[PDB]
Amino acid sequence: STNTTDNIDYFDISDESNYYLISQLRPHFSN
Amino acid sequence: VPDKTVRWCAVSEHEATKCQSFRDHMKSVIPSDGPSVACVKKASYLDCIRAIAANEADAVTLDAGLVYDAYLAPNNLKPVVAEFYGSKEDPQTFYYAVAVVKKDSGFQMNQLRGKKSCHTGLGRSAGWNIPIGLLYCDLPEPRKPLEKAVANFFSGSCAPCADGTDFPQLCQLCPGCGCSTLNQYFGYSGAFKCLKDGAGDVAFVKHSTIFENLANKADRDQYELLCLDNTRKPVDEYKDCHLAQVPSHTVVARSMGGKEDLIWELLNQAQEHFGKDKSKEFQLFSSPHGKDLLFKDSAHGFLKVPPRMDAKMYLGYEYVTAIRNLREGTCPEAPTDECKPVKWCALSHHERLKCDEWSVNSVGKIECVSAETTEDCIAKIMNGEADAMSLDGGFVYIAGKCGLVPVLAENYNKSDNCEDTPEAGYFAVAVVKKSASDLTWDNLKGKKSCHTAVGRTAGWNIPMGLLYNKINHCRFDEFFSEGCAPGSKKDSSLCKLCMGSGLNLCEPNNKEGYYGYTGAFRCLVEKGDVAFVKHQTVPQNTGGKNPDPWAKNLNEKDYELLCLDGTRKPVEEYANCHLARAPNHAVVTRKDKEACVHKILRQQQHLFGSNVTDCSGNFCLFRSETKDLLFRDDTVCLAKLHDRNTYEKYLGEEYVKAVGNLRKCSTSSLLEACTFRRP
Amino acid sequence: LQKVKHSIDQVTALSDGVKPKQVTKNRLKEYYFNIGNYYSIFKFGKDS
Ligand SMILES: *[C@@H]1O[C@H](CO)[C@@H](O[C@@H]2O[C@H](CO)[C@@H](O)[C@H](O)[C@H]2NC(C)=O)[C@H](O)[C@H]1NC(C)=O
Ligand SMILES: *[C@@H]1O[C@H](CO)[C@@H](O)[C@H](O)[C@H]1NC(C)=O
Ligand SMILES: [Fe+3]
Ligand SMILES: [Fe+3]
The domain in which residue B149 lies consists of 95-246
B32/C26 Cβ within 8 A? no
Query: How buried is B424 (Cβ within 10 angstroms: 0-12 exposed, 13-18 middle, 19+ buried)?
Result: exposed
Evaluate whether B488 touches B568 at the Cβ level (below 8 Å). no
* Residue B202 CA: distances (Å) to CA of B126, B223, B300, B554: 13, 11, 28, 78
A30 vs B302: CA distance, rounded Å: 34
- String of DSSP letters for C4-41: HHHHHHHHHHHTTS---S---HHHHHHHHHHHHHHHHH
Q: What contacts B231, CB < 8 A, 6 or more positions away? A: B108, B241
- Cβ atoms of B128 and B205 within 8 Å: the answer is no
Q: Roughly how many angstroms between the first and final C-alpha of chain A, as a whole number? A: 40
B127 Cα distance to chain centroid: 25
Q: What are phi and psi of B459, to 5 degrees?
A: -90, -35
**Is residue B33 within 8 angstroms of chain A, CB to CB?**
yes
Q: What are all long-range contacts of C2-6, with beta carbons under 8 Å and residues at least 24 apart?
A: C3/C41, C3/C45, C4/C41, C4/C42, C4/C45, C4/C46, C6/C41
Touching check for A1 and chain B: CB below 8 Å?
Answer: no
Min Cα–Cα distance to chain C from B218, Å: 45
B70 lies in the same domain as B164: no
Written as one letter, the residue type at B521 is F
Chain B interface test: which of A14, A19, A20, A29 (most B C-beta within 10 Å): A19
Rounded to whole angstroms, the Cα distance separating C2 from B258 reads: 25
**Residue B34 Cα to ligand 1 middle (Å):** 69
Structure determined via: cryo-EM
Which regions of B425-573 does DSSP assign to beta strands (E)?
426-433, 449-450, 483-484, 530-534, 559-562, 568-570
Resolution for this model in angstroms, one decimal place? 3.7
Query: Are residue B370 and residue B478 in the same domain, yes or no?
Result: no
* B629 CB neighbour count, 10 Å cutoff: 22
- Specify the amino acid at residue B65: G
Beta strands B342-347 and B405-410: pairing type? unpaired
Which C-chain residues 6-45 have CB contacts (< 8 A) with chain A? 37, 40-41, 43-44
Strands B449-450 and B530-534 come out as: parallel
Pair B311, B387 in one domain = no
Do B80 and B117 reside in the same domain of the chain?
no
Residue B644 Cβ inside 6 Å of ligand 1? The answer reads no
Domain identity same for B444 and B574: yes
Where is the domain boundary, B550, B582, B614?
B582
Is B392 marked as a binding-site residue?
yes
User: Quick one: residue B431, left, alpha or beta (phi over 0 = left, psi -120 to 50 = alpha)?
Assistant: beta
Chains B and C form CB pairs within 8 A to the count of: 5
* Structural Rg of chain B based on CA atoms: 30
Q: Are residues B237 and B166 in the same domain?
A: yes
Residue at a domain's end among B277, B304, B336: B336
Helices (H) then strands (E): counts for chain A: 0, 2
Number of domains in chain B: 4
Distance CA B191, CA B200 (A): 9
Q: Are residues B479 and B593 in the same domain?
A: no
- In angstroms, the CA B154 to CA B162 distance is 15
Co-location of B140 and B194 in the same domain = yes
Ligand 1 atom with the smallest distance to the CA of B424 is 28
Q: Mark whether B82 and B154 lie in a shared domain.
A: no
Q: Are B208 and B277 in a shared domain?
A: no
CATH number of the domain bearing residue B494: 3.40.190.10
- Please state at what angle helix C25-47 crosses helix C2-14, rounded to 10 degrees: 150
- Check if the beta carbon of residue B398 is closer than 8 Å to that of residue B670: yes
B421 Cα nearest atom in ligand 1: 20
Domain end call among B287, B312, B336: B336
> Do B551 and B587 lie in a common domain?
no
Per the CB < 8 A criterion, the answer to whether B187 and B122 are in contact is: no
Output the DSSP codes for B282-344: --SS--SS-SS-SS-SS--EEEEPPTT--HHHHS-HHHHHHHHHHHHT------SSS-PPEEE
CB contact under 8 A, B34 and A19: yes
Q: Are residues B570 and B677 in the same domain?
A: no
**Please, are residues B228 and B263 in contact by the beta-carbon 8 Å criterion?**
no
Residue nearest to atom 5 of ligand 1 (CA): B415
> Exposed, middle or buried: residue B481 (CB in 10 Å: 0-12, 13-18, 19+)?
middle
Integer Cα distance of A15 and B588 in angstroms: 47
Q: Angle B462-471/B653-660 helices, nearest 10 degrees? A: 50
